[PDB]
């Protein structure tokens, strides 16, 4: 398939490229969430006419994401309370949901797609480093606390 990128894709290229992409990749991933559009001549000319204002919105979105990363890094006041047992054993688990609830109560309605965790899900009491991906290049680090209430 010939498709026109709408965004910075990891391996395809930058905003605007006629790349020969596989049909499944374009149909199921690139097109549904706005990242690419088919290489129809109508779309090609329509994209080449208005192209200049796309990088403007892209740059302002990237700047906003960079600002969000600094904001959530500076917040760093995250606490989750759950009834846990002795020996630092957490009965249940603190998940991305609880993390998103705490960062919602702290900052601005942070969703649960950007939040990232290692293979483990912090099943023990302690302070853990939580990863956030506001953008494709944004790497944010958050400190959390858990209470065995």
């Amino acid at each position: 398939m010939q498709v026109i990128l709408l965004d910075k894709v990891a391996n395809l290229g930058s905003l605007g490229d006629q790349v020969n992409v596989k049909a499944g990749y374009a149909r199921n991933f690139l097109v549904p969430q706005g990242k690419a559009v088919p290489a129809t001549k109508k779309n090609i000319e329509f994209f080449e006419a208005r192209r200049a204002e796309l990088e403007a919105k892209l740059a302002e979105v990237l700047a906003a994401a960079n600002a969000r990363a600094e904001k959530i890094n500076a917040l760093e006041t995250v606490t989750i309370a759950s009834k846990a047992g002795d020996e630092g054993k957490l009965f249940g688990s603190i998940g991305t949901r609880d993390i998103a609830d705490a960062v919602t109560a702290a900052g601005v309605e942070v969703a649960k797609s950007e939040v990232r965790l290692p293979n483990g899900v912090l099943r023990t009491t302690g302070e853990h480093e939580v990863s956030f991906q506001v953008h494709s290049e944004v790497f944010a680090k958050v400190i959390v606390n858990v209470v065995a209430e």
Binding site: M1, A23, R27, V31, P38, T40
Partner: protein, 77 residues
């Protein structure tokens, strides 16, 4: 019924010719597959029972044109 919703491909009937040319009635079925298509103009996911050819037709024309043809000829999706 095994009917492609885009191309109207229906199961057809033919023969099973053997080496001795014995013929027994058989059926050719369309390669149908339920699929969810991202309809951007209404921000929806429309589910269609479509064959592979019909999916390729949607690929060429665009989902909007195919849905326009559908709701023009009835066959509510």
């Amino acid at each position: 019924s095994r009917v492609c919703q885009v191309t109207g491909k229906r199961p057809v009937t033919g023969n099973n010719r053997s080496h001795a040319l014995n013929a027994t009635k058989r059926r050719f079925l369309p390669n149908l597959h339920s699929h969810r298509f991202w309809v951007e103009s209404e921000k929806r996911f429309v589910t269609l029972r479509v064959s592979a050819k019909g999916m390729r037709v949607i690929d060429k024309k665009g989902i909007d044109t195919v849905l326009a043809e559908l709701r023009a000829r009835g066959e509510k999706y």
